[PDB]
PDB file of C-alpha atoms and ligand atoms in Angstrom:
ATOM      1  CA  UNK A   1     124.915 146.237 126.217  1.00  0.00           C
ATOM      2  CA  UNK A   2     122.867 142.835 126.995  1.00  0.00           C
ATOM      3  CA  UNK A   3     119.344 144.734 125.973  1.00  0.00           C
ATOM      4  CA  UNK A   4     116.818 142.260 124.458  1.00  0.00           C
ATOM      5  CA  UNK A   5     115.958 142.953 120.915  1.00  0.00           C
ATOM      6  CA  UNK A   6     112.003 143.291 122.630  1.00  0.00           C
ATOM      7  CA  UNK A   7     113.126 145.218 125.236  1.00  0.00           C
ATOM      8  CA  UNK A   8     114.537 147.767 123.298  1.00  0.00           C
ATOM      9  CA  UNK A   9     112.209 147.973 121.099  1.00  0.00           C
ATOM     10  CA  UNK A  10     109.889 148.623 123.566  1.00  0.00           C
ATOM     11  CA  UNK A  11     111.328 151.948 125.118  1.00  0.00           C
ATOM     12  CA  UNK A  12     109.976 155.083 123.757  1.00  0.00           C
ATOM     13  CA  UNK A  13     112.946 152.907 120.653  1.00  0.00           C
ATOM     14  CA  UNK A  14     110.699 151.041 117.793  1.00  0.00           C
ATOM     15  CA  UNK A  15     113.145 149.968 114.876  1.00  0.00           C
ATOM     16  CA  UNK A  16     112.116 148.043 111.271  1.00  0.00           C
ATOM     17  CA  UNK A  17     115.406 147.272 110.547  1.00  0.00           C
ATOM     18  CA  UNK A  18     116.039 145.507 114.701  1.00  0.00           C
ATOM     19  CA  UNK A  19     112.551 144.586 114.659  1.00  0.00           C
ATOM     20  CA  UNK A  20     112.366 142.407 111.210  1.00  0.00           C
ATOM     21  CA  UNK A  21     115.502 139.900 112.270  1.00  0.00           C
ATOM     22  CA  UNK A  22     114.277 140.059 115.705  1.00  0.00           C
ATOM     23  CA  UNK A  23     110.955 138.558 114.560  1.00  0.00           C
ATOM     24  CA  UNK A  24     112.529 135.821 111.559  1.00  0.00           C
ATOM     25  CA  UNK A  25     114.371 134.532 114.193  1.00  0.00           C
ATOM     26  CA  UNK A  26     112.271 133.738 116.493  1.00  0.00           C
ATOM     27  CA  UNK A  27     109.856 132.761 113.711  1.00  0.00           C
ATOM     28  CA  UNK A  28     112.734 130.415 112.428  1.00  0.00           C
ATOM     29  CA  UNK A  29     112.754 129.317 115.596  1.00  0.00           C
ATOM     30  CA  UNK A  30     108.741 128.091 116.702  1.00  0.00           C
ATOM     31  CA  UNK A  31     109.284 126.171 112.531  1.00  0.00           C
ATOM     32  CA  UNK A  32     112.773 124.320 113.641  1.00  0.00           C
ATOM     33  CA  UNK A  33     111.736 123.218 117.236  1.00  0.00           C
ATOM     34  CA  UNK A  34     108.015 123.192 117.016  1.00  0.00           C
ATOM     35  CA  UNK A  35     105.087 125.157 118.362  1.00  0.00           C
ATOM     36  CA  UNK A  36     105.719 125.312 122.046  1.00  0.00           C
ATOM     37  CA  UNK A  37     108.891 124.373 122.332  1.00  0.00           C
ATOM     38  CA  UNK A  38     110.812 127.897 121.688  1.00  0.00           C
ATOM     39  CA  UNK A  39     111.126 130.080 124.746  1.00  0.00           C
ATOM     40  CA  UNK A  40     112.231 133.179 121.883  1.00  0.00           C
ATOM     41  CA  UNK A  41     108.950 132.507 120.175  1.00  0.00           C
ATOM     42  CA  UNK A  42     107.383 133.596 123.890  1.00  0.00           C
ATOM     43  CA  UNK A  43     109.184 136.671 124.303  1.00  0.00           C
ATOM     44  CA  UNK A  44     108.002 137.921 120.932  1.00  0.00           C
ATOM     45  CA  UNK A  45     104.189 136.904 121.762  1.00  0.00           C
ATOM     46  CA  UNK A  46     105.322 139.033 125.124  1.00  0.00           C
ATOM     47  CA  UNK A  47     106.212 142.044 122.615  1.00  0.00           C
ATOM     48  CA  UNK A  48     103.434 142.001 121.245  1.00  0.00           C
ATOM     49  CA  UNK A  49     101.074 141.844 124.115  1.00  0.00           C
ATOM     50  CA  UNK A  50     102.986 145.226 125.263  1.00  0.00           C
ATOM     51  CA  UNK A  51     103.764 147.274 122.172  1.00  0.00           C
ATOM     52  CA  UNK A  52     100.342 146.592 120.370  1.00  0.00           C
ATOM     53  CA  UNK A  53      98.654 148.136 123.138  1.00  0.00           C
ATOM     54  CA  UNK A  54     100.806 151.725 122.037  1.00  0.00           C
ATOM     55  CA  UNK A  55     101.369 150.698 118.344  1.00  0.00           C
ATOM     56  CA  UNK A  56      98.598 148.937 117.177  1.00  0.00           C
ATOM     57  CA  UNK A  57      99.473 147.474 113.842  1.00  0.00           C
ATOM     58  CA  UNK A  58      96.460 145.611 111.384  1.00  0.00           C
ATOM     59  CA  UNK A  59      98.990 143.100 110.382  1.00  0.00           C
ATOM     60  CA  UNK A  60     101.121 142.675 113.577  1.00  0.00           C
ATOM     61  CA  UNK A  61      97.607 142.143 115.237  1.00  0.00           C
ATOM     62  CA  UNK A  62      96.363 139.345 112.876  1.00  0.00           C
ATOM     63  CA  UNK A  63      99.986 137.509 113.052  1.00  0.00           C
ATOM     64  CA  UNK A  64      99.718 137.800 116.859  1.00  0.00           C
ATOM     65  CA  UNK A  65      96.205 136.281 116.994  1.00  0.00           C
ATOM     66  CA  UNK A  66      96.701 133.484 114.440  1.00  0.00           C
ATOM     67  CA  UNK A  67     100.214 132.121 116.551  1.00  0.00           C
ATOM     68  CA  UNK A  68      98.437 132.488 119.335  1.00  0.00           C
ATOM     69  CA  UNK A  69      95.423 130.106 118.284  1.00  0.00           C
ATOM     70  CA  UNK A  70      97.134 128.041 116.458  1.00  0.00           C
ATOM     71  CA  UNK A  71      99.153 126.923 119.869  1.00  0.00           C
ATOM     72  CA  UNK A  72      96.860 127.177 121.804  1.00  0.00           C
ATOM     73  CA  UNK A  73      95.126 124.972 119.845  1.00  0.00           C
ATOM     74  CA  UNK A  74      97.902 122.273 120.535  1.00  0.00           C
ATOM     75  CA  UNK A  75      97.925 123.238 123.961  1.00  0.00           C
ATOM     76  CA  UNK A  76     100.434 125.311 124.700  1.00  0.00           C
ATOM     77  CA  UNK A  77      98.656 128.642 125.777  1.00  0.00           C
ATOM     78  CA  UNK A  78     101.438 130.876 126.218  1.00  0.00           C
ATOM     79  CA  UNK A  79     100.736 132.852 123.285  1.00  0.00           C
ATOM     80  CA  UNK A  80      96.851 133.206 123.887  1.00  0.00           C
ATOM     81  CA  UNK A  81      97.769 134.480 128.193  1.00  0.00           C
ATOM     82  CA  UNK A  82      99.374 137.241 125.938  1.00  0.00           C
ATOM     83  CA  UNK A  83      96.764 138.212 123.683  1.00  0.00           C
ATOM     84  CA  UNK A  84      94.164 138.409 126.156  1.00  0.00           C
ATOM     85  CA  UNK A  85      96.254 140.548 128.306  1.00  0.00           C
ATOM     86  CA  UNK A  86      96.674 143.095 125.098  1.00  0.00           C
ATOM     87  CA  UNK A  87      93.169 143.032 124.860  1.00  0.00           C
ATOM     88  CA  UNK A  88      92.053 143.478 127.917  1.00  0.00           C
ATOM     89  CA  UNK A  89      94.451 146.360 128.504  1.00  0.00           C
ATOM     90  CA  UNK A  90      94.828 147.398 125.403  1.00  0.00           C
ATOM     91  CA  UNK A  91      90.846 147.947 124.316  1.00  0.00           C
ATOM     92  CA  UNK A  92      90.791 150.281 128.210  1.00  0.00           C
ATOM     93  CA  UNK A  93      93.405 152.485 126.824  1.00  0.00           C
ATOM     94  CA  UNK A  94      92.152 152.978 123.467  1.00  0.00           C
ATOM     95  CA  UNK A  95      88.597 151.523 122.643  1.00  0.00           C
ATOM     96  CA  UNK A  96      89.068 149.853 118.921  1.00  0.00           C
ATOM     97  CA  UNK A  97      85.081 148.675 117.554  1.00  0.00           C
ATOM     98  CA  UNK A  98      86.257 145.814 115.385  1.00  0.00           C
ATOM     99  CA  UNK A  99      88.745 144.679 118.230  1.00  0.00           C
ATOM    100  CA  UNK A 100      86.159 144.618 120.842  1.00  0.00           C
ATOM    101  CA  UNK A 101      84.218 142.194 118.698  1.00  0.00           C
ATOM    102  CA  UNK A 102      87.616 139.513 118.204  1.00  0.00           C
ATOM    103  CA  UNK A 103      87.960 139.727 121.816  1.00  0.00           C
ATOM    104  CA  UNK A 104      84.157 138.473 122.470  1.00  0.00           C
ATOM    105  CA  UNK A 105      84.224 136.044 120.429  1.00  0.00           C
ATOM    106  CA  UNK A 106      87.435 134.936 121.329  1.00  0.00           C
ATOM    107  CA  UNK A 107      86.024 135.085 124.673  1.00  0.00           C
ATOM    108  CA  UNK A 108      83.430 132.720 124.231  1.00  0.00           C
ATOM    109  CA  UNK A 109      85.588 130.412 122.430  1.00  0.00           C
ATOM    110  CA  UNK A 110      88.032 129.915 125.519  1.00  0.00           C
ATOM    111  CA  UNK A 111      85.081 130.024 127.725  1.00  0.00           C
ATOM    112  CA  UNK A 112      83.454 126.706 125.418  1.00  0.00           C
ATOM    113  CA  UNK A 113      86.766 125.110 125.581  1.00  0.00           C
ATOM    114  CA  UNK A 114      86.350 125.304 129.525  1.00  0.00           C
ATOM    115  CA  UNK A 115      88.688 127.854 130.439  1.00  0.00           C
ATOM    116  CA  UNK A 116      88.306 131.335 132.223  1.00  0.00           C
ATOM    117  CA  UNK A 117      91.529 132.332 131.758  1.00  0.00           C
ATOM    118  CA  UNK A 118      90.232 134.597 128.805  1.00  0.00           C
ATOM    119  CA  UNK A 119      86.336 135.092 130.601  1.00  0.00           C
ATOM    120  CA  UNK A 120      88.532 136.867 133.506  1.00  0.00           C
ATOM    121  CA  UNK A 121      90.350 138.887 131.278  1.00  0.00           C
ATOM    122  CA  UNK A 122      87.089 139.980 129.694  1.00  0.00           C
ATOM    123  CA  UNK A 123      85.531 141.053 132.900  1.00  0.00           C
ATOM    124  CA  UNK A 124      88.336 143.184 133.982  1.00  0.00           C
ATOM    125  CA  UNK A 125      88.071 144.602 130.941  1.00  0.00           C
ATOM    126  CA  UNK A 126      84.680 146.332 131.717  1.00  0.00           C
ATOM    127  CA  UNK A 127      85.817 146.929 135.624  1.00  0.00           C
ATOM    128  CA  UNK A 128      88.443 148.989 134.424  1.00  0.00           C
ATOM    129  CA  UNK A 129      86.797 150.555 131.226  1.00  0.00           C
ATOM    130  CA  UNK A 130      85.161 153.503 130.875  1.00  0.00           C
ATOM    131  CA  UNK A 131      83.392 151.969 126.752  1.00  0.00           C
ATOM    132  CA  UNK A 132      80.162 152.691 127.522  1.00  0.00           C
ATOM    133  CA  UNK A 133      76.955 151.208 125.568  1.00  0.00           C
ATOM    134  CA  UNK A 134      79.016 148.296 124.478  1.00  0.00           C
ATOM    135  CA  UNK A 135      77.497 145.664 122.009  1.00  0.00           C
ATOM    136  CA  UNK A 136      77.844 141.914 124.258  1.00  0.00           C
ATOM    137  CA  UNK A 137      77.255 139.336 122.608  1.00  0.00           C
ATOM    138  CA  UNK A 138      74.289 137.763 124.160  1.00  0.00           C
ATOM    139  CA  UNK A 139      75.626 134.532 124.418  1.00  0.00           C
ATOM    140  CA  UNK A 140      78.611 136.542 125.986  1.00  0.00           C
ATOM    141  CA  UNK A 141      76.660 138.293 128.610  1.00  0.00           C
ATOM    142  CA  UNK A 142      75.642 134.557 129.797  1.00  0.00           C
ATOM    143  CA  UNK A 143      78.266 133.027 130.408  1.00  0.00           C
ATOM    144  CA  UNK A 144      79.672 136.938 132.203  1.00  0.00           C
ATOM    145  CA  UNK A 145      76.261 136.158 134.655  1.00  0.00           C
ATOM    146  CA  UNK A 146      77.559 132.985 135.989  1.00  0.00           C
ATOM    147  CA  UNK A 147      81.904 134.109 135.724  1.00  0.00           C
TER     148      UNK A 147
HETATM  149  C1  LIG B   1      95.484 146.744 137.149  1.00  0.00           C
HETATM  150  N1  LIG B   1      94.501 145.721 136.883  1.00  0.00           N
HETATM  151  C2  LIG B   1      94.390 144.285 136.994  1.00  0.00           C
HETATM  152  N2  LIG B   1      93.332 143.826 136.053  1.00  0.00           N
HETATM  153  C3  LIG B   1      92.869 142.722 135.928  1.00  0.00           C
HETATM  154  O1  LIG B   1      92.193 142.497 136.719  1.00  0.00           O
HETATM  155  C4  LIG B   1      91.822 140.820 136.808  1.00  0.00           C
HETATM  156  C5  LIG B   1      92.187 141.121 138.482  1.00  0.00           C
HETATM  157  O2  LIG B   1      93.216 141.488 139.263  1.00  0.00           O
HETATM  158  P1  LIG B   1      93.086 142.821 140.241  1.00  0.00           P
HETATM  159  O3  LIG B   1      92.294 143.911 139.340  1.00  0.00           O
HETATM  160  O4  LIG B   1      94.796 143.691 139.201  1.00  0.00           O
HETATM  161  O5  LIG B   1      93.191 142.431 141.770  1.00  0.00           O
HETATM  162  P2  LIG B   1      92.985 143.747 142.744  1.00  0.00           P
HETATM  163  O6  LIG B   1      91.368 143.525 143.876  1.00  0.00           O
HETATM  164  O7  LIG B   1      93.211 145.495 141.776  1.00  0.00           O
HETATM  165  O8  LIG B   1      94.462 143.241 143.649  1.00  0.00           O
HETATM  166  P3  LIG B   1      94.112 143.040 145.328  1.00  0.00           P
HETATM  167  O9  LIG B   1      93.256 142.786 145.915  1.00  0.00           O
HETATM  168  O10 LIG B   1      95.666 142.537 145.738  1.00  0.00           O
HETATM  169  O11 LIG B   1      94.734 144.666 145.652  1.00  0.00           O
HETATM  170  C6  LIG B   1      92.941 140.200 136.707  1.00  0.00           C
HETATM  171  O12 LIG B   1      92.208 139.226 135.273  1.00  0.00           O
HETATM  172  C7  LIG B   1      94.018 141.228 136.288  1.00  0.00           C
HETATM  173  O13 LIG B   1      94.223 140.504 134.655  1.00  0.00           O
HETATM  174  C8  LIG B   1      93.348 144.784 135.022  1.00  0.00           C
HETATM  175  N3  LIG B   1      92.578 144.822 133.698  1.00  0.00           N
HETATM  176  C9  LIG B   1      92.647 146.036 132.794  1.00  0.00           C
HETATM  177  N4  LIG B   1      91.822 145.664 131.318  1.00  0.00           N
HETATM  178  N5  LIG B   1      93.359 147.075 133.177  1.00  0.00           N
HETATM  179  C10 LIG B   1      94.167 147.479 134.341  1.00  0.00           C
HETATM  180  O14 LIG B   1      94.645 147.932 134.956  1.00  0.00           O
HETATM  181  C11 LIG B   1      93.943 146.227 135.618  1.00  0.00           C
END
């Protein structure tokens, strides 16, 4: 009875009706309380991080990425941490060429912002994934070399 919506939606479990109401409440809280001030919004970031690993959808991924980056620019990094976990674990489970390009792009940005959370997640993807013949950004290769 006390199931959080994100827990219900992540069960083998997702319906549009439950997700619509949940997403709307989270976004409304982010708008009212402010970026980085809503713990409900944090549960939505976490939901996306896991849900997209098994049920990718382009528009949901794009919203996740956009809001995670907006939060991170203001200094609130949980969304982006969730996004890097999605990249590293999600692309290991099923490689996606377009999403991998985004993974490289956001890792480069994160490293150039003086963070290493993203770079470690990219390194981890390379250590765990069976993907071969990756076309890795030569600047990212330099960053990984020092890691
Ligand atoms: C199980 N893990 C762990 N991991 C990433 O790998 C990095 C190092 O964590 P770890 O591999 O769990 O350390 P590990 O040596 O296994 O733990 P321990 O030394 O206690 O035995 C973390 O950035 C973490 O997010 C992973 N990354 C991907 N893509 N897939 C995975 O299954 C895993």
